[PDB]
């Protein structure tokens, strides 16, 4: 004996997985790993971030101060969850550029409220309504204040509230729209209503509109909600002669990392640093096909439901 035979080679596996390459569309390798997060947990986790269940309240209803949203008067959040089963159980209201106001409150990430004693001379405060019951008796949005004529006349109101603080003050206010012509002179005396909120930088003048609207829990009127931000040093000034929905104070704006999301998912105890409308997902992968709406330390959404990254050589089994 005086010979040998040394041969070389590589391993193989029975079940090789398929992957995509520059050349071959479907090629089989010994192993792979998924880079697209396709599945989810099914419920939102709330140990990583402070998730606040919005319940039947929307972000703007809770902001205004709706009778059934008295729980969210001073509470704050990292993420707010608006439910599709949400209602507004107070006066019928609309907001031009609704989303802007919604976004500002969401980005702020809080609803704390510092009240301020305005000088309301010659008018009556705490104006209520039957279509906004705070328990049972008539009421109104807690952060707002419905003013009406005090006795025989309505004086041209004039108040100022200087910002001596070192942050952006957010005053929420509005204007009222009576149902009929008798009602303008009844509640507010003055024939032509008007409101003029103005800073040193800008102005906002609004005019009411007397006319019937659809039936909303016993009312054919409206209240157009507006808002005004005031910077450090800058001064607030309101100048109205009727139909003024006055502010009780201001919200504290902060440059935070807070947001809002429309979801109907369950929010139970667990840890997961990404959140989608279908609950939390693991952020170990770089990509995902769960949902385009994301919050927190999340992977990037893509159209594909799977992408296989080969983690082993080309499989070529025996015959």
């Amino acid at each position: 004996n005086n010979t040998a035979t040394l041969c070389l080679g590589h391993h193989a596996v029975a079940n090789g997985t398929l992957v995509k390459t520059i050349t071959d569309d479907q090629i089989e390798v010994t192993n792979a790993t998924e880079l697209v997060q396709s599945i989810s947990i099914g419920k939102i986790c709330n140990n990583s971030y402070r998730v606040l269940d919005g319940r039947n309240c929307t972000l703007i209803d809770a902001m205004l101060g709706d009778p059934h949203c008295d729980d969210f008067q001073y509470e704050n959040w990292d993420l707010f969850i608006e439910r599709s089963s949400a209602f507004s159980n107070c006066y019928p209201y609309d907001i031009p550029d609704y989303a802007s106001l919604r976004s500002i409150v969401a980005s702020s990430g809080t609803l704390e409220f510092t009240a301020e004693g305005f000088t309301w001379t010659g008018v009556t405060q705490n104006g209520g309504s039957g279509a906004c019951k705070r328990g049972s008796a008539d009421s109104f949005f807690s952060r707002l204040n419905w003013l009406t004529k005090s006795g025989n006349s309505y004086p041209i109101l004039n108040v100022t509230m200087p910002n001596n603080k070192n942050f952006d003050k957010l005053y929420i206010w509005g204007i009222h729209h009576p149902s009929s012509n008798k009602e303008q002179t009844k509640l507010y005396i003055q024939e032509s209503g008007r409101v003029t909120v103005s800073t040193e930088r800008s102005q906002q003048t609004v005019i009411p509109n007397i006319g019937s609207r659809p039936w909303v829990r016993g009312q054919s009127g409206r209240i157009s909600i507006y808002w005004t931000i005031v910077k450090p040093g800058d001064i607030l000034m309101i100048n109205s002669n009727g139909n003024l929905v006055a502010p009780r104070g201001y919200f504290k704006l902060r440059t935070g990392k807070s947001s809002v999301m429309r979801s109907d998912a369950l929010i139970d105890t667990c840890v997961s640093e990404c959140i989608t409308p279908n609950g939390s997902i693991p952020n170990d992968k770089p990509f995902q096909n769960v949902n385009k709406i994301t919050y927190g330390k999340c992977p990037k959404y893509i159209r594909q439901n799977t992408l296989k990254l080969a983690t082993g050589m080309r499989n070529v089994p025996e015959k």
Binding site: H11, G312, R314
Partner: protein, 172 residues
């Protein structure tokens, strides 16, 4: 792959071989055998571990983003908000597809190479004591038991010892 070792000049893989990614199969005086090479295996595993750690290093921490779903129809600005998110996703989708295409095409190549390297590293050891039969198989022309084949795995085969014997058996 491109180097033509895996699924190329080597016929196929070995499902028997379970303790490594690359190795030898021999026939000598003390019967036949199989041995998985640890160095070349470990190398190829490190490169693929390296890829994983690069792709799975970071996921960006985002917070308040634009509205991507809508109830009412607004008109101008809602279309732009859709178009940004539509364009954003299309670009990342292509970035994801291209990445996984490049990576895998590179993965089959570096693994193919590590076969071709081990084959050559073994040719270079044997010197003029062994010829090349074909299909990744050397014909050694001298008595090489499991200790000798052992020196061929570790990288300590001294061809001088067996040279005279092998050069006699090749050309007589």
């Amino acid at each position: 792959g491109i180097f033509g070792a895996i699924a190329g000049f080597i016929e196929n893989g070995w499902e028997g071989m379970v303790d490594g990614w690359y190795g030898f199969r021999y026939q000598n005086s003390e019967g036949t055998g199989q041995a998985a090479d640890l160095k070349s295996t470990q190398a190829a595993i490190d490169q693929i571990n390296g890829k994983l750690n690069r792709v799975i290093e970071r996921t960006n921490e985002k917070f308040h983003q634009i509205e991507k779903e809508f109830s009412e129809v607004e008109g101008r600005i809602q279309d732009l908000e859709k178009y940004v998110e539509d364009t954003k996703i299309d670009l990342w989708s292509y970035n994801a597809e291209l990445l996984v295409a490049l990576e895998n095409q590179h993965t089959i190549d570096l693994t193919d190479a590590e076969m071709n390297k081990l084959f050559e590293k073994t040719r270079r050891q044997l010197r003029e004591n062994a010829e090349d039969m074909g299909g990744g198989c050397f014909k050694i022309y001298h008595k090489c038991d499991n200790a000798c084949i052992g020196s061929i795995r570790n990288g300590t085969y001294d061809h001088y010892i067996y040279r005279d014997e092998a050069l006699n058996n090749r050309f007589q």
